């Protein structure tokens, strides 16, 4: 049972949800910025 | 010399516009990267 307390999770599941949502928003905004500069040419 | 002056002015104007655009773009990238933190 101690060896199955080892795994790798320690935060409350609310904190896991907060981390997952924040990281989802991060990947969204970074992909949106990179797509903006994919589409935008400052020159003609 | 007048004609060469206006020609130099035109090429400087195009370069200035392109520089201001790339400068503002780099500033926006820096703002996004600092806001993500």
């Amino acid at each position: 049972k101690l060896i199955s307390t080892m795994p790798g999770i320690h935060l409350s599941p609310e904190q896991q949800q907060q981390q997952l949502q924040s990281l989802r928003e991060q990947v969204r905004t970074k992909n949106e910025l990179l797509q903006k500069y994919k589409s935008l040419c400052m020159f003609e | 010399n007048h004609e060469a002056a206006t020609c130099l002015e035109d090429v400087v104007y195009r370069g200035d516009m392109l520089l201001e655009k790339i400068q503002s773009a780099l500033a926006d990238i820096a703002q996004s990267q600092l806001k993500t933190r």
């Binding site: 990179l34 500069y37 994919k38 040419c41 020159f43 | 090429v11 370069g15 392109l18 790339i22």
Partner: peptide
């Protein structure tokens, strides 16, 4: 000016290849 333009272009040519 030309060099700067093509420089910007190839970096833009790099970025959808990351996307």
């Amino acid at each position: 000016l030309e060099r700067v333009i093509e420089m910007i272009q190839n970096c833009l040519a790099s970025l959808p290849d990351d996307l």
